[PDB]
Design an enzyme around this catalytic site. Structure first.
Site, PDB file in Angstrom:
ATOM      1  CB  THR A  32      -0.998  -0.034   1.164  1.00  0.00           C
ATOM      2  OG1 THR A  32      -1.807   1.145   1.124  1.00  0.00           O
ATOM      3  CG2 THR A  32      -0.335  -0.186   2.511  1.00  0.00           C
ATOM      4  CB  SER A  45       7.048   9.114   9.020  1.00  0.00           C
ATOM      5  OG  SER A  45       7.241  10.096   8.011  1.00  0.00           O
ATOM      6  CG  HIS A  46       2.307  10.063   4.012  1.00  0.00           C
ATOM      7  ND1 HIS A  46       1.824  11.351   3.930  1.00  0.00           N
ATOM      8  CD2 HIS A  46       1.466   9.297   3.284  1.00  0.00           C
ATOM      9  CE1 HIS A  46       0.730  11.361   3.201  1.00  0.00           C
ATOM     10  NE2 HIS A  46       0.486  10.114   2.798  1.00  0.00           N
ATOM     11  CE  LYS A  83       2.900   6.640  -1.746  1.00  0.00           C
ATOM     12  NZ  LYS A  83       1.833   7.315  -0.951  1.00  0.00           N
ATOM     13  CG  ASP A 104      -2.226  34.102  31.732  1.00  0.00           C
ATOM     14  OD1 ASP A 104      -2.463  32.972  31.239  1.00  0.00           O
ATOM     15  OD2 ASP A 104      -1.661  34.241  32.843  1.00  0.00           O
ATOM     16  CD  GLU A 131      -7.178   5.491   4.168  1.00  0.00           C
ATOM     17  OE1 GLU A 131      -6.644   4.766   5.048  1.00  0.00           O
ATOM     18  OE2 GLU A 131      -6.629   5.726   3.067  1.00  0.00           O
ATOM     19  CD  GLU A 132     -10.466   3.736   9.188  1.00  0.00           C
ATOM     20  OE1 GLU A 132     -10.570   3.911  10.419  1.00  0.00           O
ATOM     21  OE2 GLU A 132      -9.733   2.862   8.679  1.00  0.00           O
ATOM     22  CB  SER A 133      -7.465   5.471  11.465  1.00  0.00           C
ATOM     23  OG  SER A 133      -7.298   4.518  10.422  1.00  0.00           O
ATOM     24  NE  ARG A 147      -7.696  -3.209   9.496  1.00  0.00           N
ATOM     25  CZ  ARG A 147      -6.583  -3.131  10.218  1.00  0.00           C
ATOM     26  NH1 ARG A 147      -6.640  -2.709  11.483  1.00  0.00           N
ATOM     27  NH2 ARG A 147      -5.421  -3.478   9.670  1.00  0.00           N
TER      28      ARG A 147
END
Length: 514
Positions: A18, A113-114, A126, A253, A335-337, A467
């Protein structure tokens, strides 16, 4: 010293998947591993003669050595030019922007990390194609297949090219152009938002900063854009977070930017941005449409309904947004999560959402918790949680989904407890542009009140992960501030009983609850 052929032997799982190819760093460090995969990528490009290749990454150990190998193999390939980030730095939205602006043949992003989901400490490569987005499955399979049959690769032996200062530098016949990692990208963002008015709302410092993707408020891009350009206090960019729903429950403040950041889930954040899009320069004329992955909650649906724009439901992946954004059928997506984004690029964009939100906060002049409370007031709240059952034995999970699929026709129309079944199907998606049909994308129970249960199987090939997505729609404002797991208790009980989760997997408790 020049172009050389290097004999090699295939490796076993150079199958991207992916987010490109992700493996532990010692695996990518194996002799010829990176070279095999990069050769397989370049072997899908047929006419590189005058083209440009975008290259960058995120600093992480091994990126520097990898970027030098990729540059040298690009030179051997015959690219005219490689636009590579200063010090090998390029974020994924930036690379997407750069690819698109200068019409490059594609890019290679060295990041893991993306997409935060993944064994931490892994190295990733990628490959993005000409439209600026991720490579389609037809292309990643092509790469994997080539990686299994290669006897050699080509590389240009030469000493490393310095990337610390900007400019054009020769490597063979090729141009190594070192680009400011942020300039083009910050430009695009400035066409989308009122940077002046975002500086003001940071100045006054009375509102919190809102984000919807992990790591959006960290790293050099956040630092240069939020801190040096927009004037955020030093230290704003690295829990340090509060949850938007917590702040709404509290409603019933010193500078606030520098303090905690409010996390809004991508499902709700997409709805809210779409509801307030006409307040910002980049979307004054309105949206063409919205898209979300099927398991993302229906919050954005209810906004598209009132707006009179279509809302597309795509299989999970920022993949499938691509054709809809290019065609102009869709302006905003999420996109969820994972997070949200627009057609400005072809990838999820965390700062883009942070700035979007900051621009919404500046115009409406009100804290996040109240914006969210109003949104729910107007559209209703889509209570939403995911239950993950990790490491289910292989074909027990497939028996569960198979037994459930069989039961689905007789579910239609019946009333189970408080919920009446409107749709019980196996999700399939037919692309309004490709006409390519995706199937078995998950099982949907859609109820007449707006609530929903969805089952998907992940990690097939590995254990498998079940899921279970739980969505309760609550129109009544007095009921909109409950604990999500309390609100969803009845749906949770139903989802477990009808699918017989405990009976067929032996699990009494989700592995993860979100």
């Amino acid at each position: 010293m020049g172009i050389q052929v290097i004999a090699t032997t295939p490796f076993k799982d150079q199958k991207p998947g992916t987010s490109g190819l992700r493996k532990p760093v010692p695996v990518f460090q194996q002799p010829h591993y990176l070279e095999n995969f990069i050769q397989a990528i370049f072997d899908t490009i047929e006419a590189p003669q005058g083209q440009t290749l975008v290259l960058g990454g995120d600093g992480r150990y091994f990126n520097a050595e990898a970027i030098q190998v990729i540059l040298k193999m690009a030179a051997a390939k015959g690219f005219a030019r490689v636009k590579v980030g200063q010090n090998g730095i390029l974020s994924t939205p930036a690379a997407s922007c750069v690819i698109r602006k200068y019409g490059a043949v594609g890019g290679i992003i060295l990041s893991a990390s993306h997409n935060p989901a993944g064994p931490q400490g892994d190295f990733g490569v990628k490959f993005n194609i000409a439209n600026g987005g991720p490579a389609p499955e037809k292309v990643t399979n092509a790469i994997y297949e080539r990686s299994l049959a290669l006897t050699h690769y080509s590389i240009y032996t030469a000493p490393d090219v310095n990337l610390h200062t900007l400019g054009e530098f020769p490597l063979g016949e090729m141009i190594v152009e070192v680009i400011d990692p942020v300039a083009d990208y910050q430009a695009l963002l400035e066409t989308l938002f009122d940077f002046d008015r975002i500086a003001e709302v940071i100045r006054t410092g009375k509102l919190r900063l809102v984000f919807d993707a992990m790591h959006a408020v960290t790293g050099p891009y956040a630092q240069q854009i939020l801190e040096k350009c927009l004037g955020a206090p030093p230290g704003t960019v690295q829990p340090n977070l509060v949850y938007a729903h917590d702040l709404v429950q509290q409603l019933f403040d010193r500078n606030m930017i520098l303090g905690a950041n409010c996390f809004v889930t991508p499902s709700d954040s997409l709805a809210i941005l779409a509801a307030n899009a006409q307040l910002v320069p980049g979307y004054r004329d309105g949206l063409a449409g919205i898209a979300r992955s099927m398991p993302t909650s229906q919050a954005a649906d209810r906004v598209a309904a009132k707006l009179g724009i279509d809302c597309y439901e795509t299989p999970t992946g920022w993949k499938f947004f691509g054709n809809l954004l290019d065609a102009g059928k869709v302006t905003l997506c999420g996109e969820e999560s994972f997070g949200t984004g627009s057609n400005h690029v072809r990838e999820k964009d965390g700062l883009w959402a942070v700035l979007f939100w900051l621009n919404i906060l500046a115009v409406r002049q009100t804290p996040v918790a109240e914006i969210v409370k109003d949104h729910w007031r107007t559209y209703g709240r889509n209570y939403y949680s995911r239950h993950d059952y990790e490491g289910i034995e292989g074909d027990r999970a497939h028996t569960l989904m198979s037994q459930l699929e069989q039961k689905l026709p007789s579910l239609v129309g019946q009333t189970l407890g408080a919920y009446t079944v409107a749709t019980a199907d196996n999700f399939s998606y037919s692309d309004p542009v490709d006409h390519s049909v995706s199937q078995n994308q998950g099982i949907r129970l859609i109820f007449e009140d707006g609530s929903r249960i969805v089952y998907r199987l992940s990690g097939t090939g590995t254990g498998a992960t079940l899921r279970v997505y739980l969505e309760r729609f609550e129109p009544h404002p007095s009921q909109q501030h409950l604990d999500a797991q309390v609100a969803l208790a009845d749906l949770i009980q139903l989802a477990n009983d009808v699918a017989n989760i405990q009976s067929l997997t032996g699990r009494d408790r989700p592995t993860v609850i979100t």
